[PDB]
Amino acid sequence: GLVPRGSHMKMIIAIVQDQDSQELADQLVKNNFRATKLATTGGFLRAGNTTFLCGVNDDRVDEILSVINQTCGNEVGGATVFVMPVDAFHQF
Amino acid sequence: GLVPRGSHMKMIIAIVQDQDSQELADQLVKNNFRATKLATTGGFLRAGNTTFLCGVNDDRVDEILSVINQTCGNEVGGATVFVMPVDAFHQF
Amino acid sequence: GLVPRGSHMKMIIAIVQDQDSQELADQLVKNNFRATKLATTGGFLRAGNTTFLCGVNDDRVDEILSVINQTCGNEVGGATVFVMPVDAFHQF
Numbered sequence: 001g002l003v004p005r006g007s008h009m010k011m012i013i014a015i016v017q018d019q020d021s022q023e024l025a026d027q028l029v030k031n032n033f034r035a036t037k038l039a040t041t042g043g044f045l046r047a048g049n050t051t052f053l054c055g056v057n058d059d060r061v062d063e064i065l066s067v068i069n070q071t072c073g074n075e076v077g078g079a080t081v082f083v084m085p086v087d088a089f090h091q092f
Numbered sequence: 093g094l095v096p097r098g099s100h101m102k103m104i105i106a107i108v109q110d111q112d113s114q115e116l117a118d119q120l121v122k123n124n125f126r127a128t129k130l131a132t133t134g135g136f137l138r139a140g141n142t143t144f145l146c147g148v149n150d151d152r153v154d155e156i157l158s159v160i161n162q163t164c165g166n167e168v169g170g171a172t173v174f175v176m177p178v179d180a181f182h183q184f
Numbered sequence: 185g186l187v188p189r190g191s192h193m194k195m196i197i198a199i200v201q202d203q204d205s206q207e208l209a210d211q212l213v214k215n216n217f218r219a220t221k222l223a224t225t226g227g228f229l230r231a232g233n234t235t236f237l238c239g240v241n242d243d244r245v246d247e248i249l250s251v252i253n254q255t256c257g258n259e260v261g262g263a264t265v266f267v268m269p270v271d272a273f274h275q276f
């Protein structure tokens with residue numbers, strides 16, 4: 001794919017508050033992470049929030065979790081993050 | 093992560109009709125499932141539909157499939173569901 | 185699930201330019217692929233783009249990558265694609 005032999009990619013799905021999405025996007029950019037943002041809404045409170053999709057090399061997962069924790073995360077705020085396996089990664 | 097040693101999380105991606113999204117969200121809440129909703133659109137009919145993202149413990153996958161089937165699912169209606177593996181789950 | 189014993193599904197997540205989303209949706213339809221579309225936005229340029237979710241049988245992954253490459257993909261344009269494992273696939 002676009003990944004060198006011997007490494008792996010993960011997919012980060014991070015659900016954060018709308019009021020923090022701006023700060024996270026900027027800090028991901030500063031740190032050379034790529035991201036795609038989704039305007040979403042919560043099942044329980046039924047209010048808008050933001051979901052980021054971040055494809056990242058396995059080697060940098062701790063690093064990106066750290067960024068999410070610093071910029072988002074809690075009485076208020078908070079971030080919910082899933083790390084998911086990726087079979088292949090391509091750019092066309 | 094946020095998961096006890098010995099268990100695993102799965103990611104449920106459920107594509108349902110807009111007119112059923114309200115009923116599913118309420119029944120997931122009643123049953124202590126967390127969810128994130130995405131306004132989406134179908135590739136074929138090119139009309140709005142709703143996509144839910146639900147992170148759930150492996151032990152409760154049958155339970156949540158049952159909820160989706162009861163609230164959504166078909167001449168009309170219907171639900172399309174993917175169950176996907178999750179490496180880790182965090183809250184910050 | 186909805187998958188015959190011995191095969192597997194993959195989840196394709198494809199991020200493409202808005203101006204190409206129409207052409208991809210039509211070519212996926214012609215080729216008997218199902219798809220769900222998400223209006224998204226890029227982390228870096230902060231402009232609208234489109235994310236497709238495509239559940240596909242393992243046997244057809246090369247085929248669908250080929251469609252994405254032909255319709256989207258680059259001085260301009262371009263497509264970013266993740267192939268992800270799927271545990272189960274259901275329709276209700």
Ligand SMILES: Nc1ncnc2c1ncn2[C@@H]1O[C@@H]2COP(=O)(O)O[C@H]3[C@@H](O)[C@H](n4cnc5c(N)ncnc54)O[C@@H]3COP(=O)(O)O[C@H]2[C@H]1O
Pocket residue numbers: 015041042043044045046047049078079080121124125126127128129145146147148
């Ligand atoms: N396992 C999971 N799978 C998929 N998406 C997830 C998820 N956990 C969280 N999300 C998303 O993160 C948002 C904030 O979750 P949080 O747990 O920090 O904060 C939650 C939580 O404190 C509480 N909450 C949610 N469901 C609850 C429940 N059944 N009982 C009591 N409190 C609940 O209300 C707040 C707002 O939740 P809301 O649904 O509106 O919005 C949630 C949801 O969109």
Ligand SMILES: Nc1ncnc2c1ncn2[C@@H]1O[C@@H]2COP(=O)(O)O[C@H]3[C@@H](O)[C@H](n4cnc5c(N)ncnc54)O[C@@H]3COP(=O)(O)O[C@H]2[C@H]1O
Pocket residue numbers: 107133134135136137138139141170171172213216217218219220221237238239240
């Ligand atoms: N493998 C998959 N991967 C990713 N997303 C999936 C998917 N299967 C379904 N979805 C999503 O679920 C929606 C309803 O699918 P359903 O199969 O029940 O009902 C479908 C199906 O009955 C039919 N349909 C879709 N594609 C077809 C095709 N190539 N040939 C004949 N009928 C098709 O039109 C209805 C509307 O489909 P639409 O695309 O507008 O919207 C679809 C799509 O957004």
Ligand SMILES: Nc1ncnc2c1ncn2[C@@H]1O[C@@H]2COP(=O)(O)O[C@H]3[C@@H](O)[C@H](n4cnc5c(N)ncnc54)O[C@@H]3COP(=O)(O)O[C@H]2[C@H]1O
Pocket residue numbers: 029032033034035036037053054055056199225226227228229230231233262263264
């Ligand atoms: N690993 C990944 N994980 C999750 N989503 C991904 C991703 N790679 C790309 N995407 C999505 O695809 C869109 C186009 O990416 P592309 O790499 O072809 O083209 C990129 C790339 O040429 C450049 N770019 C992005 N980040 C950069 C950075 N940190 N430094 C230099 N150039 C960057 O700006 C263009 C626009 O990127 P933008 O973020 O606005 O929008 C991106 C993003 O939404």
Ligand SMILES: [Ca+2]
Pocket residue numbers: 019020021022023
């Ligand atoms: Ca802010």
Ligand SMILES: [Ca+2]
Pocket residue numbers: 111112113114115
């Ligand atoms: Ca209804």
Ligand SMILES: [Ca+2]
Pocket residue numbers: 203204205206207
């Ligand atoms: Ca076009």
